[model samples]
Each structure stands twice: as C-alpha cells, then as structure tokens.
Target: AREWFEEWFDHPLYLKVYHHRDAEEAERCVRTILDLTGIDPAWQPPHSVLDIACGAGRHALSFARTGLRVTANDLSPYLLDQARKQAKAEGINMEFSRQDMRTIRFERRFDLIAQLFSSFGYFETDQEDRDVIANIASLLNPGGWYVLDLINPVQLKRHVTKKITLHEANGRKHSFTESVRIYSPAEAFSLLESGGFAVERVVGDYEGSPFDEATSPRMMLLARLLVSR
Candidate 1:
C-alpha cells in the first residue's frame, strides 16, 4: 500500500487533483471536532497522539498546531514527504513515520489515537477487520481514547454513486465515473478501480436536513480504554 501510494500520488495529475480539494477546509472540520471532544490544549502531562494512515498530514498538522505531541504514520512515503513539507512550511514540529497499518507496532502508547477518513475496512474478511481493531486496541494507553471515522455501511448501500466529478485549477478538467460494490455488511466499499477524468462540484453546505439520530451514512466512533476495576 505504501509503495502504491508513493508512486501513484507523485504523478502530476494526481497531485493536482488532490490539493484542489483544499486541505484548509479539512483542517477546520477537524479542529471543530477536537474542540467538541474537550481536549485540553494546555495539558502538559505526557499526552501523545497517533494519526494512523494520516495522508499528507492534514489532520495531524492541525492537531500539532494546538501543541499536542503527534506521530503521523502513513503507508505512502510520498504522502509522508508531502506531510513533512507541509509541517515544515507551517513551522510546526511533528514526528512522521512510515508503516503499514496491517502490521503495526510501536515503542510507546498514545493518549489519543485517530484513524480518520474511512481508511478502515480495506481488508477482505471479518477476521482481518477484527485483527486491525485488536492491533489498534493494543496501542492505546490505559484510559486513553481512539477515534475512528468510517463510512456507514448502511449509508454506502443507500447512496452508491456510480459517477464522481472533480474539477481542477486553471481550466484543467477532471472526471471519474465508476461502479462501487459492497459484498457484505462487513466488507468496505470497493471501486471498479478505473481511470478517467472526474470533476467534484463543491457543495458549500449540507444539501439536506440535519442527520436524525435515526439514520446517517457516516459515523465517527470513540472507543475508550477499560481495565478491570
């Protein structure tokens, strides 16, 4: 996965399409979530954060700006390089590491661990998915928290779009269309993995009403550590 992202994302076409999505907007959304989580910015007692599969340091960079000691890990070295450059540009200090999430190990545990942007559910089977969960559980310190943002399986089934449209700067055109398949309730979404120009229109606001606690396709989960009392 790391090698694939490193090679695939370095292409001019890919990079152009990527940055066009605007990292700043993502940063804002993340900051809002952090504030809602009630994380103390001034808590000096050893609080470390780990961003699993952090792409280009988008979320990690935003978190680091708040003075949290962060370690950003990604499968793609190229993306990690971009992340490092972004951090350098922002004059923020963070530790970036390259590692595959499937077989991850660490010397220390984190107070908070985040796996963002639907990066989970890439595996083929339920056991594999559980293995990833177990591995992540092993990395959390006692009383720590893990935040996982994943696509709602029910939502994916409801709103499966066969077409995607993306726009680039300077009249550069991009369009992508594909059919997605979800084999089972446990399987993550999969694309036909084809290539074409797709332009994504920017919808500034939610097109519909607020999500009722009843039905929503996207979900963010917070798993807390527990020990026998």
Candidate 2:
C-alpha cells in the first residue's frame, strides 16, 4: 500500500540522499543498543539479533562484528543486494531477507530484535503499525530484548514550543497535535505496554540520553518481552 519507500529505496537516488550516514553512526547506535540490553562487549555464541530494517546492513554489519549472529530483513531488494555484498566482502556471514512490516513470519526466534533509524510508521493506518509490534513480538525468545527507535514528534514541530503539551481533539488527547503526523513517546510506551512489553529505557538519542520531548530528535526505546506471545 505504501509507495515512496518502495520506489525510492530501490532507486539509486536514495543512497545519495542518505550518503552522510556512515558505518560509524551504526557502530555508535549498536553500542548503545548492547549497553542498554546488558550484552557484553565481547559477546559470544548463543546470541542472535534480528535487524528489522537493516537497509544496506550497516547496523547489521555492526552486530556481526560483535560476534552476534545476525538476520536482517527489508522490503527493498536493491539495498538487500548491497547488504549481502558487504557482508560477503567482510566475510561476516549474515542472513538477509525481504519482508513487509505488517507480516513477518519466522520459525527461528531471536535473543534481541531491533527496529532502528525511524524504520517504522510507514503504514496508512494505526493497526498496520501495531501489526508490526504484534508480529515482531512473537519472533522473540521468552523475556527477550528489543530496541524500538522512532521519530520524535516534538522535535519535528513547525513552531517552537518550550514546553510539551497534549491537545484535546474530539475529547481525546492527540499525539502529534500541532506537529508532524507521528506518534509521541507516550503513545509509543503505551503501545509497547499493550503489546506485552515492559519499557526499560526511553532514550532520546543513540548515546542513550534521557528522552527530552522538547529537544530530542529521536526516541530509542529499550524494552523486554514480558512473556512468550
């Protein structure tokens, strides 16, 4: 149903637009992910990670570098080709596949699952987005780990607001009210809670800084699956 990511990611121009994001950034992001998840720096066998939107495999490569078995999935084949090439180039055996966010089925469960760099919220309906959570939750080991990164609706506001405020629309508090069309951190926490997760940390940046609604540009949430779903 979504078209921009389908058309744009497959085209060569998308890489040019995102040329500034380097491997170092992914390394930094992966560091925070591991730090929050309590994985050792020299983590060894029995650790598996699933990168939900490992476009071009930068973060996926980072995980493999840490000696973690990695499986990366995306909808764009062009990017997946490059990701495959890079993994082979580095001899970092990784599993790559194509999938839609709304429906991802896997028999092998993971120790850790990550959806980073604002990789979510591509659907036209809230349920479609919620579907990602439901599907992904089932793909994890019991009491497993996850890092769910998202766009910060507060920072994307067109106008300056020193204090964050929720507006009442149709007798309901609205996320992204007077701002961009995205879910706020509060909305995200609630979603995670309803999806059988316990929010362990709500960071605003890759460095694991506390979430500041008035300033942070992203929300990097670290959570745990309450139980097998």
Candidate 3:
C-alpha cells in the first residue's frame, strides 16, 4: 500500500482542495512568523526563510510578497515546479529546491526556519521524528527560530473518528480513515534528535490559549538553537 500522504496527494480533487486549504493557512503562518520574530524590512532587509516540506510553494510565495528571500524546500519535484510557476506569476522572487528534511544543508544560515501543517508527525516512530527535528536545528543560524505546527493529540483522541469523507468538484470524493496512537515523551524526543535540534518552548495550544487537555485541536512549538551549548 502507498503511504497515506502519497495516496492523498495523488488525487486530483485532493490537490485542488488541499491547495486551497494550504494557501489560506500559509498566509496565516507568514503573518504569525513576522509577528513572532519581530522581523521587519528595516532591521533585516530580505530576511532569509527556510521552509521545510513546502509543498507547491504557496507559503514561500506569500513570504516573498513581504520582501523576504525565501528558500522553499521539499521532496516533491512536481510540487516544486508548480511553486516556481506560481511565484513567477505573482512576480515573487523565490528559490525552490528538492531536499530532505532529515539531512538539510545550506551555505548561509536563515533568520527563520519553519515547518507547518502538521508536517512533523508522519514518522511512525519517535526516533525518526527526532532525527528530523535535529536536522532542522542544524540548519538554523544562532538565535534563529524554528516553528512547528502539529495536531493536539488530546483533541484527536477525544474526537477520534475512524473515517472522514470529503467531496470536491467534478463529482470526486476524498476520504481519510485513520488509526491514531498516542506517544510518550520519550517517543517524541527520539524524533527530535534526528532533526538536529531541541525544543526551546513548546506552546501547547494557540499563542494565548491555555494548555488544556481538551478544546485545543492543535499545538505549536517555538524552538531555538542553544547558542551557549
């Protein structure tokens, strides 16, 4: 059987609806990054941004609109082509590269690094997840910030529906049948090592929301390099 995401992305209707949803979230993410980082054109002209798993470059193009030099990296060449075309149409200068998140290399450090849309949890085991995180840490310059957005396990467990069906135009249907398992801290930590970074602050919910076990459907983590370590 193909990977869930592979199957998900391969569907035409999935691409259309997924792109729309992703574009909207990308805009929100860009704004959140700017506000969180206090990054302004005056202070750091052409601030460099590294986007991991930046499928189709919607978010990277959005960042380019704000005058940031964006490097959008992903494993999908098809998505890269689409992103390049989209950026060109928008007149946004951006670079797209096919790279793996597990081991990323860059000549210059970026001011900000981000992976969004629950990109972190695909690894079936915790150790793999850490490796991915550690790699992300290695890519950042000192004082650089890493932001990760993920689904809240508690909420997922509470509202655990085994299946969901989505309908798209042209009489197409997309469905998700999920089986989720909760992770221990040790398991979550293992993936961090592989990514080459450690979490600085793990915000349980949205920026201001309390860290409640219920009501929060997502978790956002703000991580930074340990300059002194």
Candidate 4:
C-alpha cells in the first residue's frame, strides 16, 4: 500500500491544494534564512545551497535568483518536473534530482542545506529521524549550515488532533494521514549535537524572533556542522 506522501505529493491535485504557497512566500523564507546565517541574499559563486524536499522548487528558485548555485531534491518525480519547467521558463540555471531525505547522496558538499515548510519530521521512527539529521550533517562542508523547519511540538495540541484530512480533487475523494513524528526543541537540539551539528540558533518565526516554545508557530533550527578535531 502506498503511503500518504507517496500518493499525495506526486499527485496533480497537490499543486491545486497548495497553489496558495506562492513565490512571494518562498522568497520571504529565503530572505529570512539569509538573515539568520548573516549571508547576503545576493551571495554569488563559490557558495552553494541544497534545498531538500523542495516542492515545485519555490525556495530553490529563490536562491538561484540570488546568483548562488542551487540544487533541489525531492522524492516526487511529478513535483520535480514541475519545478524544472518553471526554472526553464524563467531561464534559471540550477540542478534538480529525485532524492529521499533519509538516504540522500551527493558528490559534493554544500554551504547551506534547507529543509523548509515543516519538511523535517516525515520519517516514521525516532531512529530514522536521527539518521536524517546525520545525513544532513555529512553532506555539509565543515561549519556548513542546515536550516531545518518543523511544526512546533509545543504547539502540537492544535495540530495533532486532526490526525487525518479528507479532500476531493479531480472528481475523487481521498483521506490523507500525515506521517510526521513530533520532536520537541530539546530532542532536536540533542539529536543534532549527537549527529555532529551544533545548534546555532532557534527561531519561532521567519521574522527572526527567538524561539518561544509555548507560543511560536514554527520551530526553525539554524544549525551548523561541527568541525571534527
């Protein structure tokens, strides 16, 4: 049986449902990430960014427009093609590939890796979560940064109860159950340190405010690979 992510993310209906996540929103996300890392949005060659689970290439294209080398990865071929077409139409030169975050492979390291829009907690097990964190760390150059965005566990009460959602698209009805394990700030902080990443900062919002677990809408971790001595 196919999982919700396997069925939904590759479906055309996904674009319809998520059409509201426009380019402007992605641009703002990239802007915030740059501000957090102290890098100019216009950063040029010799630097690179890897956007994992980059649905439709929104954030990847945003980074590309800044003249930084960008590579976008996702598990859905349908979504990847959509992103590629948009990039081509805009004359944006970048790379795209189909990759599962848990077992992503790259020949080269990147300066920054972004997993945005609550994309970090999709794995089914706690062990897999640790593996994904280590995978991200291993793909970074020394001291490279990873922008990991997730649904704030502290605010999970509002999110967890839903359990499942039913939607109709293309004249069909489907019930989707999201497959993400909730992780708290301390758990993520500890997992990152164990995986060779150090938490540089934690923010509750894209506006650069410090993280307040009890109130923030999001848990965005700005972590960096620790230099091995």
Candidate 5:
C-alpha cells in the first residue's frame, strides 16, 4: 500500500482542498524571500531556482515571472500537469517534473532552493528525512541558499488537534486525520549542519518576523551551503 501523502497528494481533491492558496499569496512570498536574501533580479547571469514539492507551481511561477530560471519538482503528475497549464497560460517558461523528494537526482545546481508550506517530514524514519536534507544541499551551488518552511513543532505540540475538516468545492465537508512527524528547532539545525549547510536564520512566518517558539505558527529556516575549503 502506498503512503497516505503519496495517495492523497495525487488525488484531485488535494487541489480543490487547497484552492485558496492563490497567486497573490505566492507572489507575496516570492517578493519577501527575494528581499530577505538580496537576490538581485538583474544580475549578469540570472540565478537558477528550484522549488521542491512545488504543488501546482505557485512559487515556481512567481519565481519565473521575476526572470529567474525556475524548475519545479513534485511527486504528483496531476499537480505537475496543472502547473504546466498554468505556466502556459501565464506565458512563463519553467520546467516541471515529477520527482519524489527523497530520491530526486538533479544534474544542474540551483542558486536558491525552497521547500515551502510545511512540505517536510513525510518519511517514517529520521534517516529518510536526513537523506532528503542531504539531497537538498547537494542540489545547490556553492554558497547557494535553501529555504525550509514548516510548522513549528513547539507550537504544534501545544495546539495539537486530532483531526481537521475542510470544505471542498462542491459544498462537501471532507474530514481526515493525518500523521506527520514534527521536528524541533534543535533537530532542524542539526540536520542542516550535518548536511553541509550553515544555519543563517529561522524566521516565524512569511513576513520575516522573529521566531518565537511559544507563539509562532511556522518555522522558516534560511540557510546557506557551506563549501568545504
């Protein structure tokens, strides 16, 4: 049997359930990230960007529109098709491919890599999770940046809920329980360092606010690849 995420993400219901995450929010996030990282759009050689687990190409399209060479990889073929259609409609050029985050092999390196919207911690074991992190580091160029956005474990533990209910497009109520592993700040830092990344900053949200374990809803790690001398 396939894992819950592998099945659920490929279903059409996943798009309908997450339809509210529109282009506006994606553009805002892209702008915020560019400003935070100081990635100049008009550099002599345009930067390469990779969006891992890029569902429906929201951030991927945003990055492409900003004139970056963008590649969006995800596990769902259905989502990749949607991303291609959207990219075509918007007249943006981007590469969309189906890839499992755990075993993605990219020959080209990227200047910026992002795994956003709580897309981490789907594997059953810590080793699998570490493998994904190592892959992220390997796919980046020397001194490249990687952004990991996830739910804050401290906040999640305090406000843990057993189930969630979402209203689908046809006025139907869909309720399901999901099991996801949560990692603390220490764990995330250690994992990135072990993967050859220098921890830069951990922000709370998309607005770049300071991370407060007690009240913050998200943990956004912005780190740089540490090139060995």
Candidate 6:
C-alpha cells in the first residue's frame, strides 16, 4: 500500500487544504534563508539550488525569481505538473523532476539544498530516513548548505491538535487528521552529522528566532556538508 503522503500529496485536495501557502510566505522564507546564509547575489556566482519535495514550486519559483539556478523535485507527478504550469505562466525558468526522496540522484552538485515545510521523516524505518539525508549530502557540493524546515516535535507534542478542517472556496468542507514523525533537535543533529553534514544552527521559525522548545512552532536547521559524500 502506498503511504498517506504519497497518495494524498498528489490529490487536488492537497492544494486546497494548503491554499494558505502563498507566494508571499514562500518569498519571505527564501529571503530569510539567503540573508541568514549571507548568500549575496552580487558577490557570489549564480548559485544552484535544489528544492527537495518542492510541492507546486512555491519556494523553487521564489528562488528562481532571485536569479538562482533552481530545480524542484517531488515524488508526485501531479504536483510537478502543477509546478510546471505555474512556472510557465509566471515566466520563470525552473527545472521540475519526479523523484523519491529516499533514492533520488542528481548528476551535478548543488550550492544549496532545501527540504521545507516538514518534508522530511516520511519513511517507515530509520534506515530509510537516514538514506534520504545521506543522499542529500551526496548531492551537495563540498561545503554546500542545506536548510531543513520542519515541525518542532518537542513543541508539537506539548500542543497536539488532533484534527483540522478547511472550507474551500468552492464550499467544499475538507477535514483530515494530521500525523507526522517529529524529530527532536538532538535526533536531527545526530542524523545530519552521521550523514556527513555539520550542523551550524537551529532556529525556531522563518524569522530566524532562537529555538524555544516551549514556544517555537518550527525547527529550522542550517547545516553544511562536511565533504562531498
């Protein structure tokens, strides 16, 4: 049987359920990441960026708009098609490809890679999860950066909301239970280090605030590949 994410992510309902993920939010997050990393557009070469599990190209398109060579990869072809259509409509040049996060490969290395919006920790086993991180490390250029944006498990457990409901513009009521494997900061640090990445910092939210286990809603990890894997 296919995983819930693998099936649900491809459905049209996924877009409607996540309609609040707008361009402004994506642009702000991208800008924050670039600023945090000190990746100046004028000072640096045109850097290559890869958005792993880039659903509908929100962040990938934002990166392209900032003059980065961007590629978006996801397991769902439906989402990739949507991303391609939007990229064409917006006149943004970006590459979209179908890839399973666990075993994806790229011929060329990327200057920066990102897995945003709780995109990690989908597999059933720890080995599978580790394989995905290891592959991401291998896909980065030496000393390249990776930004991982995920839910803070510590905070999530403290504030668990079992269900969410959304009313679509078409007057359709959609309700679903949400569940995800949440990784603690310590687990994330250990996983990244074992995958050949050095953890640089852990922030709370997109604004780059210090992580507070009691209040933070997100865990944003900034790491660098120790060496090409």
Per-residue lDDT tens digits for candidate 3, residues 68-119, read 8889997756568778888888878887778776677888888778887655
TM-score of each: 0.66, 0.79, 0.71, 0.81, 0.82, 0.80
lDDT of 3 at 155: 48
Q: Compared with the true structure, what per-residue lDDT tens digits does model 5 show for residues 1-229?
A: 1111221222222311122453365787788789888888778689999999777578889899989999999876656877898899998999876888888998789999999876777666778889988888888888999988877755432112223354434665545444455678888889898889988888887788889888887788888999778
Model 6 quality (TM-score): 0.80
Q: Which ten residues in a row are the worst by lDDT in model 4?
A: 1-10
Count of clashing residue pairs in every prediction: 12, 0, 19, 0, 0, 0
| Model 2: CA > 4 A from native | 1-23, 41-44, 158-181
Error (Å) of candidate 2 at residue 179 is 15
Candidate 4 local Cα displacement, residue 102, angstroms? 2.1
Name the candidate that leads on lDDT: 5
Prediction 1 global C-alpha lDDT: 0.56
Q: Judge candidate 6 at residue 164 and give its lDDT.
A: 38
Local distance difference test, each candidate: 0.56, 0.74, 0.61, 0.74, 0.75, 0.74
Indicate the worst ten consecutive residues by lDDT in candidate 2: 1-10
Candidate 6 lDDT tens digits, 88-150? 998988987788888788889998999987777666667788888888888888789999997
Q: Sort by TM-score, best first: what order?
A: 5, 4, 6, 2, 3, 1
**lDDT score, candidate 1, position 44:** 83
* Per-prediction CA RMSD (Å): 10.7, 11.5, 7.0, 6.5, 6.7, 6.7
Q: What digit string (tens of lDDT, one per residue) describes model 4 on residues 1-229?
A: 1112222232222211122453366787788888778766454454889998787578889888888888999876766887898899999998997878788899999999999876666665688888888888889988899998876655533113113332334534444345666677887788888889888899887777788999987788998888888
Question: lDDT of candidate 3?
Answer: 0.61
Better of 2 and 3 by TM-score: 2
Give the distance in Å from residue 184's predicted Cα in candidate 1 to where it truly belongs. 10
